Structures are given as C-alpha cells and as structure tokens.
Amino acid sequence: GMTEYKLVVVGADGVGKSALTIQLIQNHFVDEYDPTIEDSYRKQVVIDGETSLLDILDTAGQEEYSAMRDQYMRTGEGFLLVFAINNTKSFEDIHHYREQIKRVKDSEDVPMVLVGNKSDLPSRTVDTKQAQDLARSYGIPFIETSAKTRQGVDDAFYTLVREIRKHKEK
Ligand SMILES: CN1CCC[C@H]1COc1nc(N2CCNCC2)c2cnc(-c3cccc4cccc(Cl)c34)c(F)c2n1
Numbered sequence: 623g624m625t626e627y628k629l630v631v632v633g634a635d636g637v638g639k640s641a642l643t644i645q646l647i648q649n650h651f652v653d654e655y656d657p658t659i660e661d662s663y664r665k666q667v668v669i670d671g672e673t674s675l676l677d678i679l680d681t682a683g684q685e686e687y688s689a690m691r692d693q694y695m696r697t698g699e700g701f702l703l704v705f706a707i708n709n710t711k712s713f714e715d716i717h718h719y720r721e722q723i724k725r726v727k728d729s730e731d732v733p734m735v736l737v738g739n740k741s742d743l744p745s746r747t748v749d750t751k752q753a754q755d756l757a758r759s760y761g762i763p764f765i766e767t768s769a770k771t772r773q774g775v776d777d778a779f780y781t782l783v784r785e786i787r788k789h790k791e792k
C-alpha cells in the first residue's frame with residue numbers, strides 16, 4: 623500500500639484496548655484476550671481514497687519506564703487515549719498517558735484521539751460531557767466506542783489517521 627501509519631493504543635488495564643484492536647482487524651469481539659500480551663497488528667484500509675497501512679501497537683504488560691520503552695513509544699505517530707465509560711479510574715488515568723506521550727515525543731502537539739469505550743454498557747460512571755470537555759481542553763477529537771458492537775471503532779482509528787494527516791501539514 624501507499625502510506626504507513628504507526629498507531630499506538632494506550633490506557634489502563636481492562637478498558638478494552640485489545641478488544642478494540644481485534645475488532646478493527648478481525649471484525650470480531652474477543653472477550654478475553656490475554657491481558658499481559660503487548661503486540662502489534664497491521665490493517666490495510668482505504669481512508670478518504672488513500673490506501674493506508676495501519677500498524678497498531680496494543681500496549682500491555684509491566685508498567686516500566688526504561689529508556690528502551692521510551693524509544694519504542696517514541697516511534698508511534700498517533701495515539702488512542704482509551705478509558706472505559708464504566709470506570710472513573712481509567713478516565714482519571716488519561717492525564718498520565720497524555721503526559722507520557724508528550725514526554726517521549728518531546729512535543730505538546732502529538733496526534734491523539736480520546737476514546738470512551740464500552741459504550742454498550744448501561745453502568746456508566748463517566749459523563750459524555752466530562753469527556754468532551756477534557757478532549758476540548760486537549761484540542762483533540764473524542765469518539766465513543768464499543769468493541770462489543772463495533773460502534774465507533776472505525777471512526778476512532780480513522781479519525782486518528784486524519785489527525786496525523788493534519789499534523790503533517792502544519
Ligand atoms: C501507577 N501508574 C502510574 C499512574 C497510573 C498507573 C498505571 O499507568 C501506566 N501503566 C502502564 N501499564 C500498567 C499495567 N499493564 C499495562 C502497562 C504503563 C505502561 N507503559 C507506559 C509507558 C512507559 C514509558 C513511556 C510511555 C510513552 C507513551 C505512552 C506510554 Cl503507555 C508509556 C506507561 F506510561 C504506563 N503507565
């Protein structure tokens with residue numbers, strides 16, 4: 623294909639990063655992907671007429687801040703900041719992940735999208751308004767998703783590609 627994109631999915635354990643990744647790639651809901659396994663996948667898609675090679679890093683594993691991990695994260699071109707709408711802690715952690723991205727990217731303008739996952743669940747504890755206000759403060763889009771139903775999944779990843787395109791033309 624034509625353009626390759628290095629996307630990175632970050633967020634607390636259990637918010638659905640693996641399930642979102644497998645949905646995009648396989649169009650199936652995996653309800654228990656090994657929570658410790660970090661891996662990357664490829665999706666070849668046409669987005670707005672451009673053939674796109676999406677490399678998606680589904681982050682997982684031990685929390686560690688070695689120079690080596692910083693450099694691996696530094697290679698990502700755009701990030702999904704994922705929380706789960708039924709998990710306030712995962713939303714409170716969003717600040718941490720945004721700041722780690724900025725730290726290793728050494729920049730305040732990195733392509734990012736805010737993702738509220740598990741939108742199918744009725745047990746909401748994070749208001750849609752709160753997430754919109756945060757994403758507005760960050761200057762990034764906000765997409766509600768459900769890896770279970772595939773709601774918003776294509777929109778989230780494709781919006782991230784569009785944010786990378788915008789960044790490149792700045
Ligand atoms: C006590 N912690 C601090 C406040 C909340 C809580 C957990 O925060 C958390 N947890 C992780 N793990 C938790 C256990 N399983 C999954 C991995 C992380 C893994 N790697 C990186 C990471 C490392 C280095 C550079 C990055 C540059 C960009 C992006 C990332 Cl994501 C980066 C982290 F920052 C992680 N932060």
Ligand SMILES: Nc1nc2c(ncn2[C@@H]2O[C@H](COP(=O)(O)OP(=O)(O)O)[C@@H](O)[C@H]2O)c(=O)[nH]1
Nearest residue numbers: 635636637638639640641653654740768769770
């Ligand atoms: N109802 C619902 N459950 C989900 C959704 N996404 C993930 N899960 C479930 O939430 C748990 C965490 O999923 P995982 O994909 O393993 O989260 P990660 O730890 O961020 O990779 C698993 O039991 C998944 O089946 C979603 O959109 N809706």
Ligand SMILES: [Mg+2]
Nearest residue numbers: 640656657682
């Ligand atoms: Mg996982």
